[PDB]
Amino acid sequence: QLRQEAEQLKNQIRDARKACADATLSQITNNIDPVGRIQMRTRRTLRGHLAKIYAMHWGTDSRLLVSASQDGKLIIWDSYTTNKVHAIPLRSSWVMTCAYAPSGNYVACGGLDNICSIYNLKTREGNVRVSRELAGHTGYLSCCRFLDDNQIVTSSGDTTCALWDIETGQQTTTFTGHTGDVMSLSLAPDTRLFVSGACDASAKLWDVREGMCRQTFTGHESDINAICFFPNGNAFATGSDDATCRLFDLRADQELMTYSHDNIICGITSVSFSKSGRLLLAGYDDFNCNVWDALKADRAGVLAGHDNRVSCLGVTDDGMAVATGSWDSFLKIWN
Amino acid sequence: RKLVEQLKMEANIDRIKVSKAAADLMAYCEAHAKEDPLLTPVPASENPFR
Amino acid sequence: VVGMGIVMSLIVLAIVFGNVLVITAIAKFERLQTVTNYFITSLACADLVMGLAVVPFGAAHILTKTWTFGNFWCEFWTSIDVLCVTASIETLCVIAVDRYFAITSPFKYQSLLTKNKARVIILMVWIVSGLTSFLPIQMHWYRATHQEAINCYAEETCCDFFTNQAYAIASSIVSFYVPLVIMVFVYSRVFQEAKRQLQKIDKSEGRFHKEHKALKTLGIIMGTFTLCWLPFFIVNIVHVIQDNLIRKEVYILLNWIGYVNSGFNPLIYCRSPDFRIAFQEL
Amino acid sequence: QRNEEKAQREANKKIEKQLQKDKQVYRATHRLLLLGAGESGKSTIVKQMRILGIFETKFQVDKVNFHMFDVGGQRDERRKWIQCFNDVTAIIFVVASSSYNMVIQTNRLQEALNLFKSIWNNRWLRTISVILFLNKQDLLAEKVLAGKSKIEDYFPEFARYTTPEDATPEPGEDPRVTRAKYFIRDEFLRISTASGDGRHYCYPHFTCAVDTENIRRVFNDCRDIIQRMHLRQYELL
Numbered sequence: 001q002l003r004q005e006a007e008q009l010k011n012q013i014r015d016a017r018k019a020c021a022d023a024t025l026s027q028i029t030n031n032i033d034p035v036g037r038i039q040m041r042t043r044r045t046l047r048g049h050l051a052k053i054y055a056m057h058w059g060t061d062s063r064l065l066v067s068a069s070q071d072g073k074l075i076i077w078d079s080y081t082t083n084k085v086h087a088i089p090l091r092s093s094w095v096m097t098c099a100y101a102p103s104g105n106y107v108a109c110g111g112l113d114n115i116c117s118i119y120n121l122k123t124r125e126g127n128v129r130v131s132r133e134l135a136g137h138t139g140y141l142s143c144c145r146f147l148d149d150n151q152i153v154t155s156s157g158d159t160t161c162a163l164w165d166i167e168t169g170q171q172t173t174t175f176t177g178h179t180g181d182v183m184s185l186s187l188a189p190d191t192r193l194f195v196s197g198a199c200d201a202s203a204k205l206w207d208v209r210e211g212m213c214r215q216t217f218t219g220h221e222s223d224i225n226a227i228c229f230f231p232n233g234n235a236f237a238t239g240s241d242d243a244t245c246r247l248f249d250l251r252a253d254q255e256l257m258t259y260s261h262d263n264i265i266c267g268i269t270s271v272s273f274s275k276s277g278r279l280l281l282a283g284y285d286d287f288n289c290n291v292w293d294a295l296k297a298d299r300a301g302v303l304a305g306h307d308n309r310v311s312c313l314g315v316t317d318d319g320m321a322v323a324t325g326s327w328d329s330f331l332k333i334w335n
Numbered sequence: 336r337k338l339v340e341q342l343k344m345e346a347n348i349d350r351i352k353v354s355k356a357a358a359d360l361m362a363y364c365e366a367h368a369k370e371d372p373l374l375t376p377v378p379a380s381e382n383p384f385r
Numbered sequence: 386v387v388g389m390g391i392v393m394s395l396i397v398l399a400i401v402f403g404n405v406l407v408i409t410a411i412a413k414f415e416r417l418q419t420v421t422n423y424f425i426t427s428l429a430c431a432d433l434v435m436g437l438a439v440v441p442f443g444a445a446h447i448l449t450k451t452w453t454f455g456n457f458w459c460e461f462w463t464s465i466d467v468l469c470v471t472a473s474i475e476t477l478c479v480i481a482v483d484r485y486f487a488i489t490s491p492f493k494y495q496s497l498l499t500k501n502k503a504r505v506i507i508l509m510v511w512i513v514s515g516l517t518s519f520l521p522i523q524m525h526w527y528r529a530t531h532q533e534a535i536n537c538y539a540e541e542t543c544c545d546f547f548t549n550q551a552y553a554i555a556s557s558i559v560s561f562y563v564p565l566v567i568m569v570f571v572y573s574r575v576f577q578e579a580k581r582q583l584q585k586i587d588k589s590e591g592r593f594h595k596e597h598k599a600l601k602t603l604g605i606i607m608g609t610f611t612l613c614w615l616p617f618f619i620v621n622i623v624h625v626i627q628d629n630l631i632r633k634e635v636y637i638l639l640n641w642i643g644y645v646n647s648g649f650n651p652l653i654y655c656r657s658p659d660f661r662i663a664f665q666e667l
Numbered sequence: 668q669r670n671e672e673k674a675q676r677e678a679n680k681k682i683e684k685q686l687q688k689d690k691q692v693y694r695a696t697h698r699l700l701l702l703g704a705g706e707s708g709k710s711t712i713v714k715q716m717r718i719l720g721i722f723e724t725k726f727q728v729d730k731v732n733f734h735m736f737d738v739g740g741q742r743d744e745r746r747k748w749i750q751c752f753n754d755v756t757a758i759i760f761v762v763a764s765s766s767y768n769m770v771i772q773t774n775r776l777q778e779a780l781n782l783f784k785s786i787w788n789n790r791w792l793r794t795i796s797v798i799l800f801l802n803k804q805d806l807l808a809e810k811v812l813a814g815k816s817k818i819e820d821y822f823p824e825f826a827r828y829t830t831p832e833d834a835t836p837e838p839g840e841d842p843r844v845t846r847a848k849y850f851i852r853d854e855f856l857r858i859s860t861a862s863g864d865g866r867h868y869c870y871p872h873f874t875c876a877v878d879t880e881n882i883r884r885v886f887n888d889c890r891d892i893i894q895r896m897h898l899r900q901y902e903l904l
């Protein structure tokens with residue numbers, strides 16, 4: 001019946017995927033000259049957080065950034081001169097994510113209190129104060145990203161995502177289909193699609209305008225902790241806790257390469273690409289970050305300046321610096 | 336019920352060869368490798384963090 | 386004498402090698418910078434100054450059997466001896482009291498020992514050590530009165546030690562005897578607390594599963610210090626209370642036995658796993 | 668120019684002036700995590716102590732600041748938010764000891780034991796101690812005194828168990844209820860003692876709803892936890 005018909009299509013899909021595998025990315029890129037050795041040295045170190053750090057997001061001007069810590073603070077920095085600009089106190093001390101609006105007027109936050117809060121930075125005759133509280137999820141928030149000054153996409157631990165409207169505080173649409181907690185998401189360069197990785201080892205490609213899933217990728221073996229588009233917009237990468245990364249292609253609808261090593265047995269907390277899409281930077285539970293090669297799957301540098309687990313990682317829009325955060329309450333700018 | 340309908344939509348989608356996708360990604364990387372400050376170290380004159 | 390000069394070169398190296406690492410590791414690594422490490426670095430600095438400017442000149446004077454640096458340098462060297470010995474013993478008492486506060490009252494330890502008060506405590510310790518040595522010695526408030534004392538004071542080649550009855554007692558009491566009773570009381574209380582906690586653990590889950598762990602550590606810490614510094618501070622008063630009883634070789638030997646505690650300290654106070662990792666990194 | 672840079676340091680100085688003041692409060696407060704199971708009695712216990720999304724309560728005893736957290740609204744079999752609570756002073760585990768004959772299938776005590784085993788053997792909670800409250804004692808006593816149900820049928824190992832020699836039964840108590848009370852405590856302690864080696868311990872207490880000594884028990888257990896931490900750090904234990 002319905003159950004039997006379900007498995008009939010699950011085997012048709014694999015046949016279609018296997019027919020288009022003319023060759024592998026490793027085979028095609030054999031003659032590319034190796035990138036070599038890449039060494040980065042710390043340029044700035046930011047101090048002031050009283051506890052471990054979970055979130056960090058760069059500004060669009062490549063100069064300011066925001067950070068979130070479990071002591072209940074949201075500090076806005078100034079990387080060029082190492083000067084604190086703001087420090088917003090939080091009502092709940094369990095914060096798990098943060099974001100920075102493209103226009104810089106607003107900053108979002110959320111955590112174990114099931115609520116997303118927006119703070120109006122550039123206000124007249126006063127300080128920063130909360131502007132709107134968005135409620136309706138039934139699980140801890142995992143991520144949230146700004147589309148424009150009036151819309152935001154959030155994902156929570158109730159196996160669902162939602163698209164909000166900040167002006168009215170209502171869920172314009174909701175996305176369902178995951179069977180486990182959703183752990184991260186990332187918007188496309190043109191903000192027409194986004195991908196989300198969950199705890200059932202599966203990633204999907206949603207459509208913001210319509211509100212439906214389009215593709216599903218199931219290459220991993222365990223929980224997925226990070227996700228990020230390629231700069232092109234036609235590929236993305238994932239990072240799981242079985243010490244493996246993978247590169248997926250939307251058009252080919254299947255996996256292309258795996259970034260794994262025999263000497264690594266620790267989980268991955270975050271991933272990020274480079275400006276030109278040639279390097280892939282990843283974080284690890286073993287206190288240091290490794291730099292891969294997108295087209296070769298060969299390690300080409302290690303960043304080992306942290307004394308505890310690395311929890312967040314980001315690259316500026318102009319591709320000039322790399323910011324990392326850890327559980328020892330220190331940020332570092334590499335270049 | 337829902338799954339049967341869902342995989343019905345995912346079954347009928349056009350797919351291109353893996354070679355074409357690999358060639359396109361490598362072409363993009365080769366074209367944009369020039370303006371990557373992290374791939375090739377920049378002069379110290381224009382490094383705001385140094 | 387030929388063999389003696391060879392072995393003494395190891396003592397100078399041991400004091401300087403083992404104390405530079407302690408200072409560099411604390412400064413180089415930010416995770417080791419706590420409140421308790423300030424006292425350790427103060428003790429290390431005192432021992433470093435001793436090993437750099439006390440042992441060498443004393444060894445040269447022993448070898449050459451004469452002083453070839455006038456009299457001002459002899460007095461300065463004596464002042465440095467007393468200042469560095471006094472400022473080293475008094476930091477062990479500070480460390481003992483710090484541990485006593487940490488274990489006996491655990492809720493108030495965070496508020497009591499702030500990073501601001503440690504600096505005041507260290508400054509007070511170093512000031513009290515300085516007032517004991519430089520002020521009386523440099524102003525001739527300690528010289529003796531017999532013929533031998535003035536005879537050696539006149540000579541520019543004789544640099545010997547002579548004191549009156551009051552100053553020897555005062556220096557010994559301020560330097561050694563007062564910290565000893567404090568440290569003994571503190572460590573007795575700490576041992577009692579550890580024994581009580583172990584007894585409670587045993588009574589709680591005895592069926593599913595004494596004090597040697599605390600006994601070994603306390604024995605090491607107390608025995609090293611006492612064995613190093615007790616005989617010297619007994620003879621320092623004995624040879625003044627009743628003269629013509631203590632020889633010069635005995636005095637020098639006991640003083641030099643006392644010196645080596647400066648080199649032995651980092652093998653006792655820097656055995657934590659973090660210190661081991663920091664040392665292995667270098 | 669330099670006119671704007673001057674004001675940057677002024678606002679920076681005010682920020683670090685306040686961060687120094689707020690650090691004193693953070694380091695002088697103790698955080699506790701309250702766990703349990705279905706119908707165990709977490710809310711009933713926390714309500715009495717307070718009189719003396721997420722739910723948090725602040726109470727002060729002997730001029731010491733305490734701060735409690737009860738995780739509610741997130742009901743997941745797998746816990747991925749458990750990584751956050753790896754720097755708390757202690758964990759409070761509440762279990763209904765009078766629920767051995769109730770089917771959730773397996774009993775409810777078996778589910779509680781499985782949950783306790785999973786929490787104890789966890790990568791992030793390899794240092795945090797547990798304060799264990801064995802709730803609902805009067806119901807257990809009534810069930811044992813009645814002959815309606817026997818623990819042997821649901822727990823076959825109870826047949827060969829004998830009362831420990833070292834015990835402090837309450838005044839006017841019966842051997843049967845004492846044996847039944849001690850069996851479950853020993854069942855929890857057996858799982859507790861296997862894994863850890865001095866890094867963390869378990870503190871079991873027998874608790875009802877009426878008694879009001881729970882705050883003193885939490886105070887004493889936290890004091891012992893910190894003392895043992897310091898003693899182990901100084902290599903004296």
Ligand SMILES: Nc1nc2c(ncn2[C@@H]2O[C@H](COP(=O)(O)OP(=O)(O)OP(=O)(O)O)[C@@H](O)[C@H]2O)c(=O)[nH]1
Pocket residue numbers: 703704705706707708709710711712802803804805875876877
């Ligand atoms: N007679 C009696 N009932 C108790 C006692 N302790 C708890 N209860 C019962 O517990 C009920 C309320 O506690 P729970 O049912 O566990 O609900 P809760 O307090 O919110 O705890 P959770 O279910 O874990 O959320 C009360 O209505 C009582 O019937 C007790 O000591 N004696």
Ligand SMILES: CN[C@@H]1CCc2c(ccc(O)c2O)[C@H]1O
Pocket residue numbers: 466467470471546553556557560640
């Ligand atoms: C010759 N060396 C001196 C002699 C007397 C003396 C010493 C150390 C501490 C004191 O309080 C003293 O009085 C010795 O180091």
